[PDB]
Amino acid sequence: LIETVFVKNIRMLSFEDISKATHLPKDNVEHLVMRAISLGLLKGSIDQVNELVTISWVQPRIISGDQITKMKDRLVEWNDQVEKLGKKMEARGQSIWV
Amino acid sequence: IHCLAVRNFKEAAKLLVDSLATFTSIELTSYESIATYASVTGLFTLERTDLKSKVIDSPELLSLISTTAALQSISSLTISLYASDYASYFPYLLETYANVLIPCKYLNRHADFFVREMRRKVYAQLLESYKTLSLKSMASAFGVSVAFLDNDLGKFIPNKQLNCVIDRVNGIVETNRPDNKNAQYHLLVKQGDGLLTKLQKYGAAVRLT
Amino acid sequence: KAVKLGDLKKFTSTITKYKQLLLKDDTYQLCVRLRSNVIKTGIRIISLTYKKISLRDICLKLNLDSEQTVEYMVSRAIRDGVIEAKINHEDGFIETTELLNIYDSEDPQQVFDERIKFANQLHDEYLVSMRYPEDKK
Amino acid sequence: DDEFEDFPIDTWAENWDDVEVDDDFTNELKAEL
Amino acid sequence: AIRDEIAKNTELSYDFLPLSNIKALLFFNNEKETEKFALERNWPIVNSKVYFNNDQKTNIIEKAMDYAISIENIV
Amino acid sequence: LDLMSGILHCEDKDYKTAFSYFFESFESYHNLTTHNSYEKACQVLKYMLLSKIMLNLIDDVKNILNAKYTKETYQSRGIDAMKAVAEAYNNRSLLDFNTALKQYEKELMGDELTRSHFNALYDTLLESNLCKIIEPFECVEISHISKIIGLDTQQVEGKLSQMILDKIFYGVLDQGNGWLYVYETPNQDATYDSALELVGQLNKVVDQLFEKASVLY
Amino acid sequence: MSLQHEKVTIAPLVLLSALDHYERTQTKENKRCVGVILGDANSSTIRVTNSFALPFEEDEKNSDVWFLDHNYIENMNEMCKKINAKEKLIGWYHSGPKLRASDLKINELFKKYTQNNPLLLIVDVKQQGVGLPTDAYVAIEQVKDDGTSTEKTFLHLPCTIEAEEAEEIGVEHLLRDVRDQAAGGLSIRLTNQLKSLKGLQSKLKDVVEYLDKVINKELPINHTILGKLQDVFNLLPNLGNNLQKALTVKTNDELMVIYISNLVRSIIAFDDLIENKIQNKKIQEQRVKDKQ
């Protein structure tokens, strides 16, 4: 369950996907996520009328070398956005920045 | 009395309802006409709680109901509205329009205004609780033809006075519930525009001087 | 009054009756253009009070002709801003949707921005006019 | 102070809506049945 | 011009409009020209059932900064 | 005099004054001891408990019942009946109140004031029970509500419309198949009302200020 | 053992004494300067109040050749106690510019003189920084981030410069030529906002640079840092849907309040204009009828 959440990503899920990826029947997935939430692996919330298991913060994992590049690029994009916003803010209100 | 005269009915309701107890100004009008005016305004403005404590249980009115045909008709209309007597509401409204509004002075000029809002009040009372009422059931309840009810109800919807949409294909009168935030925002925008225009005009007047 | 009721017959009668007075004010050219707005407001009235309305009834309440003309007018109207509705040709019914809550979008931002602009410029000219008696003081 | 002589004065040789009346609708035809 | 105006009107109003009614709605004469015109407007012709489908200022930031500037410049 | 002043006040549905009068009468009748003192004490006990009930305060009813001398000798089967009605009102169960009234009628139909008041008490209990069963629901069925309350569909529908019009619970009744959609209370944020009163006051201030400017003109 | 490292407060006198010390001993480049940080402690917020010079010496060589006088600490302690017994030794400071090798080693020398855990105070005495030139570093023992033996190392603490009544008076007098005492409220808050945004950008650029270094393996792999960065990414809210609607409705309400307040301000200006015009007319009439 944890590896499928971390690979497939998606803050939501489905009963069928968990059943196929864990070999348990579609009726025992609920108890599986019960154990997962109780033990602290996830902090999600179940939904049985439409099987749409919702996932939030997941237990952290040791980060490999490849993941550094993606995080670095995301940092670069975030920093560029921040710099552009700061430049616009400084340019627009230079009459009162004293 | 003056507030009732010029189409206000808001302050008039309060002051006439209060004045039923202390009315020593017989030089303006008799006590019966004051009771009639107070009942009319209280019916026309007050909410289903204020009616239960100001116009339908007031001992001053209770002791004087069986003294004048106009007071009897207005009290019957009020009790029909409060008791959900929707079957005979419209004939009672017509009787009150004939016997209480036209003969008087301060009310005959407002004969149309009072009648129009009474229909709106009864429609709002009927459509507040139900959410998918049928047009045939409504027409049977009010003792009118369905086409006439549709024609009458087609006037209070476009101005967003009532709260419903008429589904003529089926006859369903499905209710629409608005959010008071929207209406309050529109009212605030209009009032601010008016005040700002007034202030700009006055300022233009005073800066030249 | 004719526009508010959205009746083309009354509008035509009024236009024909007061044609000379309307042209003497040099506004008859503008006023004849109101004919489209009469149709627009009639469709607005018959679309705000009818969630699902048969096309024949739309034609009758609009004082108009066979279904094709009504369909053309409705199709023109919905893409012209007014009448956030939808037409389905199965059985002649214009299933108009609800109205989006205005207090959920950026329109109040624009309205309040205009109001703030007007108030701020008003206060600015107010101060600049007030300032002279300071020397005259 | 301007006389506005270019625009000649035209020669002639508590209220909102409620300009129509409902009259006596009655509709006793429903009461007939 | 009439036909393209009617096409613009129909692109937003009708959903799942049969092509047989389109042939008369657009004032055309024969189906082939109707299909060609629909292809020009890039409407799908699935089973003759056309499915139409289909700057001012930075919000918050610009307005708030401009209000602050207007308040403090005149001071 | 105190007892009958309370009796007349109870006809005005004001019970605090009625409760004070009844308590003074009960103390007066408890001090002395004649042949008819016991009957007067029992009747005034019934009247005070009746007056207390319509303003809730069930814990105080229990306190009065558990008062030592009141339950020592003045305790009687009629006070048992009235305390059963009290606890039925506490649980907000129309069935329990009806059972208590039917089983203990001999102590309650008498003292005409008690029955005339208990009619309105029954109406209030019906409204309260219809409020309680509806609380854990969003789309309850009218048939299930009628089964729980034991009433009829038409009477339940009428009572529900009456309470909805009076704004007791902010649900909306529907005629689909007997559904009773229940919606949370609206918000009506106070900021806009305050802003509107402010706008009116500033309008008046504008008129007064321009009037002050007449001397300038 | 006391856990008192949550907050650090420095009076400006300690820091200015640090600057005076550095400019006094004629310290050239690479020569650090060290003194003691006399203050009060045993509360959650460690507070530094007074300092003095120390005869710290060290050759730019093997880190263990550092020298420091032991008698001087107690000798200063006795005199300072005679002057004021409410100031107790709570550690030491060095004249920046950044943490060195011997900081952990020398800190243990002050263990006996201090009562709680000794406090390190880095002072950017030559002022390369942009933010506060002071940061605290309490030596604590925690497990290694690499899954190895537990290490007794330094921990950064949030340090805020705050003055008392005695020193605020002098600070306000000294810089009473550059501080903009008029400033304005909203303007100063907006300037603070822009400064905070620029600081965020600078820290982001520093983190990006460090990651660029680690991908080239000039630095080892710390799993704690990467985990904290991944947590930062996880906590990043997604706005560009329910949160968006809530924020929009709050912004609309807030703008309506702004509109009301601006209306009130305009009417106040209107009354001011009316009164001022009245007084001007009265003054004109006064001068006219008194001249004639």
Side-chain angles (χ1 to χ4, degrees), chain B residues 34-160:
Chain B
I34 277 295
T36 278
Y37 301 166
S39 289
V40 154
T41 62
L43 207 180
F44 168 79
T45 81
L46 297 181
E47 184 264 8
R48 220 180 188 284
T49 292
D50 327 329
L51 285 186
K52 195 42 197 171
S53 184
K54 300 273 203 179
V55 200
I56 208 49
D57 62 352
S58 165
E60 286 73 13
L61 282 191
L62 260 305
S63 68
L64 204 67
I65 278 145
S66 303
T67 51
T68 288
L71 217 292
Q72 175 187 355
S73 34
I74 289 292
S75 77
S76 208
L77 179 72
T78 306
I79 196 46
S80 68
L81 182 51
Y82 183 78
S84 315
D85 194 317
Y86 294 104
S88 47
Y89 176 85
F90 266 30
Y92 282 143
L93 168 64
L94 274 197
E95 297 155 25
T96 63
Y97 170 75
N99 296 28
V100 166
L101 282 98
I102 31 182
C104 175
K105 299 187 48 170
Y106 328 86
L107 276 206
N108 175 46
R109 217 267 270 183
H110 301 49
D112 143 279
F113 181 44
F114 168 74
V115 162
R116 139 174 271 261
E117 205 274 343
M118 262 313 93
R119 316 221 274 215
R120 173 199 162 286
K121 250 204 176 182
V122 110
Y123 291 160
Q125 254 208 5
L126 185 44
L127 283 193
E128 190 164 19
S129 64
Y130 287 70
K131 206 213 161 185
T132 306
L133 172 43
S134 97
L135 264 185
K136 217 158 306 304
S137 170
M138 226 167 149
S140 72
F142 288 143
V144 306
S145 75
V146 196
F148 165 67
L149 202 148
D150 180 288
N151 178 25
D152 198 7
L153 217 153
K155 314 176 178 181
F156 306 87
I157 299 196
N159 322 74
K160 275 305 311 171

Side-chain angles (χ1 to χ4, degrees), chain F residues 71-210:
Chain F
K71 68 174 179 305
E72 268 179 5
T73 56
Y74 286 147
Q75 187 215 348
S76 52
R77 167 228 165 196
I79 305 308
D80 192 312
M82 164 85 71
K83 101 180 181 179
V85 164
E87 288 196 17
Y89 189 95
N90 188 7
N91 318 346
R92 306 174 305 174
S93 38
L94 179 136
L95 183 295
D96 282 22
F97 164 85
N98 206 350
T99 301
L101 195 146
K102 172 214 58 53
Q103 179 163 348
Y104 293 70
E105 71 281 40
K106 302 307 300 164
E107 312 277 352
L108 298 185
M109 335 156 268
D111 329 332
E112 166 202 23
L113 165 83
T114 38
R115 210 176 39 197
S116 162
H117 266 322
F118 269 11
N119 277 11
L121 182 43
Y122 163 84
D123 276 358
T124 291
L125 262 175
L126 176 49
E127 303 215 350
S128 181
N129 208 215
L130 286 159
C131 213
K132 183 197 70 173
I133 316 159
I134 288 307
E135 191 168 56
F137 279 112
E138 156 98 357
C139 263
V140 86
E141 301 163 303
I142 283 183
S143 301
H144 156 91
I145 270 287
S146 171
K147 294 320 285 146
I148 299 307
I149 191 49
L151 259 283
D152 185 27
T153 301
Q154 282 69 37
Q155 313 182 10
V156 160
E157 274 224 57
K159 198 50 165 164
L160 278 164
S161 35
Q162 175 186 348
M163 40 204 41
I164 288 196
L165 294 167
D166 292 337
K167 293 179 185 56
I168 301 169
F169 73 94
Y170 293 119
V172 302
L173 186 46
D174 197 71
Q175 270 285 7
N177 39 310
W179 290 354
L180 193 182
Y181 309 77
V182 174
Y183 290 156
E184 69 106 16
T185 86
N187 37 306
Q188 53 274 6
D189 188 313
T191 317
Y192 283 86
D193 324 285
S194 295
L196 295 184
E197 321 315 330
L198 176 145
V199 162
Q201 288 274 18
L202 268 89
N203 268 328
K204 278 161 204 33
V205 152
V206 154
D207 323 289
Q208 289 183 0
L209 257 173
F210 174 68

